[PDB]
Each structure stands twice: as C-alpha cells, then as structure tokens.
Amino acid sequence: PDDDRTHPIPDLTGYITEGQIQLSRELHRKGIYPPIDPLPSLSRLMNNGVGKGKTREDHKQVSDQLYSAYANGVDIRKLVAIIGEDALTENDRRYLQFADAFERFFINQGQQNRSIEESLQIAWALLSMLPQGELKRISKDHIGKYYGQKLEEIWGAP
Amino acid sequence: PDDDRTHPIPDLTGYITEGQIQLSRELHRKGIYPPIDPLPSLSRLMNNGVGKGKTREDHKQVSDQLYSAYANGVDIRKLVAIIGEDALTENDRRYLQFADAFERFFINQGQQNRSIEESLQIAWALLSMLPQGELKRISKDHIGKYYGQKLEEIWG
Amino acid sequence: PGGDMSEPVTQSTLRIVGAFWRLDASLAFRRHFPAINWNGSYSLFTSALDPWYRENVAEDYPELRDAISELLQREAGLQEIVQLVGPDALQDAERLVIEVGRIIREDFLQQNAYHEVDAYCSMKKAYGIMKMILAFYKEAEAAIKRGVSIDEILQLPVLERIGRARYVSEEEFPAYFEEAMKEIQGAFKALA
Amino acid sequence: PGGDMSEPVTQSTLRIVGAFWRLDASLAFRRHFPAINWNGSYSLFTSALDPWYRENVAEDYPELRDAISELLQREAGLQEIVQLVGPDALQDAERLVIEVGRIIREDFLQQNAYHEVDAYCSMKKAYGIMKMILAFYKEAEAAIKRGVSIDEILQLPVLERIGRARYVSEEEFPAYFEEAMKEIQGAFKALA
Amino acid sequence: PGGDMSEPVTQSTLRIVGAFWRLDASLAFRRHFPAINWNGSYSLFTSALDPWYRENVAEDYPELRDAISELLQREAGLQEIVQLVGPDALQDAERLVIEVGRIIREDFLQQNAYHEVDAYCSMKKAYGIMKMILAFYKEAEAAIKRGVSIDEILQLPVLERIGRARYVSEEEFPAYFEEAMKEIQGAFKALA
Amino acid sequence: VSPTRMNLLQRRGQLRLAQKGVDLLKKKRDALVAEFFGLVREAMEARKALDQAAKEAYAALLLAQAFDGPEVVAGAALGVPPLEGVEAEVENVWGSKVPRLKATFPDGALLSPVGTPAYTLEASRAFRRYAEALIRVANTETRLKKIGEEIKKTT
Amino acid sequence: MAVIADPETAQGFRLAGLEGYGASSAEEAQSLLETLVERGGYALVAVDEALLPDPERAVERLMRGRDLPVLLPIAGLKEAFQGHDVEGYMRELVRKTIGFDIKL
Numbered sequence A: 001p002d003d004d005r006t007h008p009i010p011d012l013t014g015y016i017t018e019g020q021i022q023l024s025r026e027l028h029r030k031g032i033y034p035p036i037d038p039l040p041s042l043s044r045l046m047n048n049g050v051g052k053g054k055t056r057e058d059h060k061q062v063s064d065q066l067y068s069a070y071a072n073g074v075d076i077r078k079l080v081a082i083i084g085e086d087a088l089t090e091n092d093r094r095y096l097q098f099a100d101a102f103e104r105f106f107i108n109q110g111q112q113n114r115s116i117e118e119s120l121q122i123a124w125a126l127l128s129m130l131p132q133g134e135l136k137r138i139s140k141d142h143i144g145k146y147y148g149q150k151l152e153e154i155w156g157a158p
Numbered sequence B: 001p002d003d004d005r006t007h008p009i010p011d012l013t014g015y016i017t018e019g020q021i022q023l024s025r026e027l028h029r030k031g032i033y034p035p036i037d038p039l040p041s042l043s044r045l046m047n048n049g050v051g052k053g054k055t056r057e058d059h060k061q062v063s064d065q066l067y068s069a070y071a072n073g074v075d076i077r078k079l080v081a082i083i084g085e086d087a088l089t090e091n092d093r094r095y096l097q098f099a100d101a102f103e104r105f106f107i108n109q110g111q112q113n114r115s116i117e118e119s120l121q122i123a124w125a126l127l128s129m130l131p132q133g134e135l136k137r138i139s140k141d142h143i144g145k146y147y148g149q150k151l152e153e154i155w156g
Numbered sequence C, D, E: 001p002g003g004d005m006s007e008p009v010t011q012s013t014l015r016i017v018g019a020f021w022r023l024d025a026s027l028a029f030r031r032h033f034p035a036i037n038w039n040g041s042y043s044l045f046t047s048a049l050d051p052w053y054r055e056n057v058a059e060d061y062p063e064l065r066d067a068i069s070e071l072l073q074r075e076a077g078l079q080e081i082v083q084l085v086g087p088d089a090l091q092d093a094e095r096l097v098i099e100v101g102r103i104i105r106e107d108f109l110q111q112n113a114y115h116e117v118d119a120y121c122s123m124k125k126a127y128g129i130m131k132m133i134l135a136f137y138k139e140a141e142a143a144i145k146r147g148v149s150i151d152e153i154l155q156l157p158v159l160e161r162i163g164r165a166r167y168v169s170e171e172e173f174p175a176y177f178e179e180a181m182k183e184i185q186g187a188f189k190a191l192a
Numbered sequence F: 001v002s003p004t005r006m007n008l009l010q011r012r013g014q015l016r017l018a019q020k021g022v023d024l025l026k027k028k029r030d031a032l033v034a035e036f037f038g039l040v041r042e043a044m045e046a047r048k049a050l051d052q053a054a055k056e057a058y059a060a061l062l063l064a065q066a067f068d069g070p071e072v073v074a075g076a077a078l079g080v081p082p083l084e085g086v087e088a089e090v091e092n093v094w095g096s097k098v099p100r101l102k103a104t105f106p107d108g109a110l111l112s113p114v115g116t117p118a119y120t121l122e123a124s125r126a127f128r129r130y131a132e133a134l135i136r137v138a139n140t141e142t143r144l145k146k147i148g149e150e151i152k153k154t155t
Numbered sequence G: 001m002a003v004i005a006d007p008e009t010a011q012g013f014r015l016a017g018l019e020g021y022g023a024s025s026a027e028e029a030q031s032l033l034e035t036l037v038e039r040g041g042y043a044l045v046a047v048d049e050a051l052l053p054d055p056e057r058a059v060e061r062l063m064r065g066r067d068l069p070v071l072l073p074i075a076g077l078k079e080a081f082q083g084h085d086v087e088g089y090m091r092e093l094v095r096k097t098i099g100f101d102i103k104l
Helices: A008-016 A025-029 A059-083 A090-107 A116-127 A140-146 B008-014 B025-029 B059-083 B090-107 B116-127 B140-146 C008-014 C025-029 C050-056 C061-085 C092-109 C123-145 C158-163 C173-191 D008-013 D047-056 D061-085 D092-109 D123-144 D150-154 D158-167 D173-190 E008-013 E025-029 E046-056 E062-077 E092-109 E123-146 E158-163 E173-189 F005-068 F070-078 F118-154 G007-015 G026-038 G086-098
Strands: F086-093 F096-103 G002-005 G020-022 G044-048 G070-074
Touching (some): A025 C061, A059 A090, A059 A116, A059 C061, A059 F005, A090 A116, B059 B090, B059 B116, B090 B116, C050 C061, C061 C092, C061 C123, C092 C123, C092 C158, C123 C158, D061 D092, D061 D123, D092 D150, D092 D158, D123 D158, D158 D173, E062 E123, E092 E123, E123 E158, E123 E173, F005 F118, F005 G086, F070 F118, F070 G007, F086 F118, F096 F118, F118 G007, F118 G044, F118 G070, G002 G026, G026 G044
Parallel strands (some): G002 G020, G002 G044
C-alpha cells in the first residue's frame, strides 16, 4: 500500500509462501525493464531444482558469485560520488564497472525471450570483467571451462 | 492544541475559510511583535484586491520574491546547524543576513501604524541587499524603477 | 484529513485511477507552484501515447522526456548526501548535476497560473525549453572535462536566457529559441 | 502520564491559566532544583506589575530583568555550537557569555528549600544579586578588549563572593552587597 | 516479524526460559553458520553442570572453556581500533590475539550441518580442539616474547592442521590429536 | 510531530538514510587513513634526508670556521642580501587549501663568485642544499597535519 | 625564511642567503618568535628543538587568525653530530594526530 513491508497483507503472505520477487522503483525510473531487484529477492526452493541433471551444473555457484559481486559494487557506486573515481583502488573500479554493466545488460532485457543457456552465457560474459581468481565461490573446473568469454556476444548483438 | 496544525479543528477550519494567519512561538520567544510566521500563512483573495489601479503595480511580484528569498534563508539556517557557519559561501551568507534583517525589521514593528507605501518601501529596501541578477520573479522594468534603496537612511 | 495520505478514500481512489498527481504542502509554503510532488506521482498512459507524440510533436520527444527524467532521478539520489556532508563536499560533476536539477525545477516545472503569458504553454514550447536545457547540460559537462570550474560556468549570461524563456509569447518563441541555441554555442566555445 | 505534555488535562488547563510553570526531568535527576524550564515557561502578568516594581523595589528593576533574560537567551543559543565544535573554537567573548550564564544558572536560579537561610529570599536581595552579576559581566567585558584572557578573569577571587552571596542572611546582606561591589571595582582595576 | 527482539512473543518467552540462543542476520549474510551471536546469548546452567563436566570429560574443562571465552572477549574490545586503522599497523601483542580470534571463529565455532562428519561432534573432540588452540596461543605468545616477527608465525603449516580438525573422523581423532600436539611443539621449538 | 501513519513511514525512511550515511562516512575515513599511512613514509624519508644534510653542513661549517677564520665568515655572510620571497601557492587536499611553499631563490643571488675562501663557498653550497631539504620537509608536514584533523572531523 | 638558533650557526644561514637570528634560551626564543609573528613577510620559521620543542604551540593564541607562516622544529646543533631517531619522533607525531599510540 505504501511500499510498506510491515503491512498485514505482505506480512502474512511471507508466512505462507516460499520466497519473494521484489520490484524496484528506482530501476523503473531509470528505464530498466523488467525492474526486478536482485538484493531483497529470495527463493526458498532454488537448491532442489537447480543442479546437475536438471539444468547446467554451474548454476548455484554462478548465482552466488553474481549476488556477491553486485552487492559489493552497489556501495562503491555511492562512494565514488564523494571520493572520486581516481581515488579508488583497481578492484573497486572493476566492481563499479561490473555493477554498471550488470544493470545495463543482465536485468534490462526488454521483451526478449531468453533460454536458460543464453542467460548463463550472459552471466559468464559479465563475470569475465572481474579478474580471474577473485571468484572465490566458483570451483576451478567451471572457471577453467567457462571463463574468458567476451561481452561482445550481447554487446554487438543486443 | 499543542501547536498542532493537523488537529481536527484547525484542519476543518482551513478547509472552509479563505486563508489563515498563523503565529509562531519561536518568534514570540525572541521578542518580535507581532509574531506572525509568513510561510504557513495564506490569503486566497489577494489577487483580486491588488495590482495596477488598486494599490500599486509591483505588489504581487515583490510579495512573491520575498517569499522565495525567505524560504532560501530558512533552508540555509537549517544547513548551518549541520555543517557549521564558517563553511558557507558568500551567496548563502547573503540569504542568511537577509533572513535575519527581515525578521528584525519587517515583521517586528510594535504598535506603530504603517501605510502600504511605507511597507513597500521597507520591502524594497530589504531586497536591495541581494544581487540584482537574483531577482527572478520581478520584471526588469520594476527593478529599474525601484531597486537601489538603503535601509539605514529611514531610521538613521 | 490532516494531509494523511493513508486515508481510506485516498487508498480506494489510488487503486483505480490511471494517473496520480500528488501535491505537497512544503512546496506550497515556499510559493512553488503547481507544487506537484515529483517523487510520489506517476502516470500509466505514457507508453500508449508515444506514437502520437512522434507524429505530432517531434520524432525525438520521448528520448528528451526520458533524458529529463534521468536527470531528476540522479538529482534525487544525490540529495541524501548533501543533507549529510553539505553541498560543497561533492565533486564537480555532482555539483553540475545539482545545479542543472535546480535549473530544471526553477524554470521548467514551475508555472504561474496568474501571469498573462505563462498561464498557458503549448507542447512545442515545452519541447524547445527541454532541448535548450539538455544542450546546456551537455555543453557544461563537456566543458568540465576541459578543467573549467563549476562556479565559473553558472556566471554565464546564457542562464538568464533559459531562466526567462517561460514568459516569451507563443508567436515570439521561435526566434527566441534559435537565438538561445546560438548563444549556447557562443558561450562555451569562448569560455576556455 | 510519563511526562507527556500533550495529554488532555494539561492542554485543557493551559487555556485558562495566566501563568505556566514548566518542570523538567532533565534538571531534577542531576539535582538542579527548583528545576524550572525557563525556556518553556511563561507568565502573562509581567507587564501589569511594572508600576508596582518601579516604586517598591527600584526604578531600573525591569531593565535588569530584561538584561538577564537576554543573557540567558544568548547562552542557550551558544550551547548548541559549543556542543558540536568544542569549547576551544569559541572566541573569548563567547567564552565570557558561557561562563556568565553558568554563574547565573548556578547562583541566581538555583535555590535550596531546606537550607535555613536559602529557603526565603526578599526582593531586594535578588535585586542586589542581579546588580552584582551584571556589574561583573560589564567589567569582564571591558577587560577583554584590553587584552586580558578569560583564563585570568575566572581565577579572580571575587566570583566566589558572588557565589556565596545567596547564603547570606537578610540582616547581613546590605553590608555584604556594598563590600562585594567595592571588591569587584577594585579587583577589576588592579587586574592588568 | 522484523528481526526485532521487542516483539511481545519474544519478551514473554525470555522471562521464563533458562537459556537464550540469539541468531544474527549479519552472520547469516556472511554465511557463518550457525549464526549464533555469542554476545547477546546467555545460559544459566553452566555452574550446575560444572561437577558433571570434570568427571566425564576432563578435569581441566571448566577452567579451559573460560580461557577461550576470555580470548573471544579480548578480540571484541579491539574492534574500535581495527575499524579505524588496518590490522597491519597493530603491534604483535594484539595482532596475535586477532589471529587467534579468527582461528577460533573459523575452526571451532563454525560448523556445517550438511557435511558427512562435521554434522556431529562429541565432547572429547571439542575438548581436543580447544586444547590445540590454547597450546598454539601459548607457544605463539612465547615466540613473540623471544623477538620473532608475526609474519613467520602465520606461515607455519600447523595452522592448516587445526583447520582440518573439524573434518577428521570421530574414531580417527585420538591419533590426529596426539600427532598435532607433538607437531606444534616440534615446530615452535625450532623457531628463532 | 503529529502521530500519523505517513509520519511513521517518513521516520523509518530517515532512520534508513542515517544508517546508510554512517557506513558511507566510515568508508571515507578508511580512505583517509589509507592516504595518511602512505604519507607518513614520505615524511620520514624527507626527515632523515634533512638530518643527513644538516650533519654534513655542520661538518663543513666547523672546519670552515677554523680554516678561514670567524671574522672572514662573518664578513662573507654580510655580503649577501637575504631573501624572503617564496611562492606560497595553495594546494587542495579534500577541499581544504594548504600552503605549498616554492622557493624563488636563484643560484646567482649570492655575491662574490670568486671564492678565495673556498671552505666558505662550500659551506654556502651545503647550507643551500640543507635549506632545500628543509622546505621539502615543511611541504610534507603541512599536508600530514591537515589530513590528521580531517580524520578527526570525520570521526 | 627565518631561522632561530644559537649564534654558533646563525651566520651560516646568512651565508645561505637567508635571514637568521641568534638565541640562547627558551625566553630569548619565545621573545624572538613573538617579535617575528607580528612582523610580516615571514613565510617559514625554523626553531631548534633544544630551544623550543613545540614551535607552533608557542604562537597558538596569535595564530588562530592566520595561516601563512609555517613553523618547523629542526635538529640541535651538537645533537646533529651524534644524530637522533627520526622514527621515534614519528611515534610522538602519530600519537598527537590519531591518539592510539599504535604504529608498526
């Protein structure tokens, strides 16, 4: 009713349902559709459906790494406005550029229909901006198999 | 009651009447009389009885410019309490001094009786403290006609 | 009652109307009219009217409207820092964003309903004002990279031309617009 | 209930009474009695008693009352700055105002209702205390412009005589007042 | 409903329970499981359980648990300095307790409920882990007192042996504990 | 403040804004401290270089006093017009302005290029180098002392 | 720039082309700096630590309204030959600035 999550209707809904997807007003005003905010969203039953034999086996680690990297970048994007970009460290600039490109490409898909393999390919393309070895959450086999893809596969084919 | 504007009696009164005059306890604590706070006050029928051929041709623009300048001064007063006075630029100090002089001379008048011409003269004297380029809401002809007064000559 | 937006009538109306124009008391105190609260207002008819605007107003009108909305959103996101550390602690580009947002708020959104000329504004006049504001913003952003300080830029006489384009008559606006667009080039190509 | 002044009984009472004495819990729990909040309180009989005060106490009594009220106002204004910037950033002139306000608060306003002498105070005793405090303030203000630091003034032994003045009985006060005034005038002349 | 402990159900529950384990959202965000806050939690059965522990576990157990509690308490008092200045500017006398606090938090308090062997832990295994941690603390403190630098201490391979103590099997643990206790003395004796 | 639902929501928003601002200011303090601990090393290096220059200058002066004679040294110093002209240009550090002194002292401002008392000339050269080291030390210290109080203000 | 020390080295500063004055006591040094602060043109004053370990402290009640002249403590005359620990002075400096007395 007033973007209030303490209202009885959203409060009692969370007592019965198995997660939530939350829309963002500032993403909507920035021209991004669909405006789904990855920070407050949560799915309780994600671990049973993903994994080897029902989807690709790198799903969970990639999702966790994306969550951590975006959560890191969103605060550097505010610290820059005070201390200036040239005063940041190198990894902070990497995270800032990743957090910009994430909202630019991964979320703002428009009316396009994306399969799971396409979304995983885009997610791996974004993770290649970060330096190898910073991906603490992903095992070595998946890094050796999927890292290094260019972002031009969606940049030059929007 | 409890100086609350959202009490049902002031709310239902303001939904009917053509305006209100609201007093300020903060101005009363400082010895200013009458303690009328101009920001929450309002008069709906002002536009009918002022203007050319009724009081003077520059009434409404002066009234608007005073409101805008006073609001900027109040905002700068609020910001000073957080960042301190010494960090102010000259542009903010001009509005701060305008707000102080406004409260000490225009609102505070005692029991004396003022004609409309004296009030407009004082208002134009106050607006002369600000730069000429900051008077956005006043037409340039009125600025050329009336700008350039000094407040101290009236009392000293 | 009392300005409480959680009133049952307000909440019942909010779920069925297609547009919502919220007013603010704080803007009305300082005599800033029409005092529409930009942060809590919306319209659901914006997307369906885009083919009409391209045919009748200009081909690039939705892009200009979205560009203005981006500047307003960026200004709204930066005021949480100004209230914390003061406006003078920000960088140059942030100060430019704040000043352009102030220009937009004072000149484009504001409208006097009792003035002889400003009471009615056609669509093409608003389009011209938005084009002027965006051109000034892009030129100032470019001049920032050349090392020119922000407080030097706001002393330019072209700011008066933008700030008083409201009061130009409907049939005199086409000449004023083309004069201001040339003055924009005449300002930033000689400042540095 | 719980010190909430917005409750119906207090609001109904405040509409008919001519004087309002407001007590503060911030003063009662650090043993500053009578703990009257001198900023929130008011009286509507002050102007009507001036003809009586001018002939039964002294002709300049309201002037001293106003001169002390304005000093309290200025100290209250300076406290919000001294509580954010530290006691060193103030000028010596503002330090003098702070110290005079502290002297006023801890000597004139504070009264012990259980002491055998301090329980009662005539009008002339309070008038003498006010005169002594204002004379000390005037001498200290004159001494600051002569180049004397605030540190030298506060160590003068004559401020102890002001602090002990309220414990002097009604019979001994007319001589104590003259002795204290002479000591103030001598000590501020000999100093620097 | 919101992670607040002022909710009436929590306030009515904590009045009568004998123990109180408080989970923290900050630790769950960092994937530190279990997310028990060891500052807000408490228990009231330790003193009554003390006679049972010294017969069935070890004579030293009640006077060994409090040493680790003291180590955890000393780490919490240094957070106001670590937040201001980075850990590398601290002296070795408290850099050592910072490292020992990290070792405790990541090798003893943390437990994986989905693991095959870490899901269950008997009392003697925990007692052996505590003994190893305290032996490391004593030897490292002595080596620091000799005059060695803390960089060479943190490179020692025995720190990984303490890290593997969680996943060792329940019946393999008695040999691993003896080997670790010999290895730690052998390594710290050979230090400079 | 009148108790309504809208005011309660506004107060919650204010609390969240303050909570974000605290962490933002802590990050700013971390950046300032990282700058401070990098500047202190340069300060120490400049200080020890100044100490070495002072040692060699006094070692030259003690011998030059003996060989040339105190009256010759006194007369030689009186023949040079002393200079106070320096470029006290301002420097920016986190918005505040600090002086960064630059010497306008030329190598030709000293009279008598014919150095028959060669020890006096060498002492003059050593003292010029010592003055250069001293002004470099001052230029580091003026920034360090202001970064410290910026950290204090943020805290 | 000005520099005050004992007269055994005052002529060397004039030999460097700089104004230099002699002082042999803390009272002489404080009187000389009180003369220098009311004087103009002085952008830098170097004061021996033997005469005054705190050159900027001794002027603080007159320096609150200005920022041009910088003040710097310099090494002693006889002490410079045997040297001193510049890394011990940095400990006191960092203790003055951040207070924790913690430095590695």
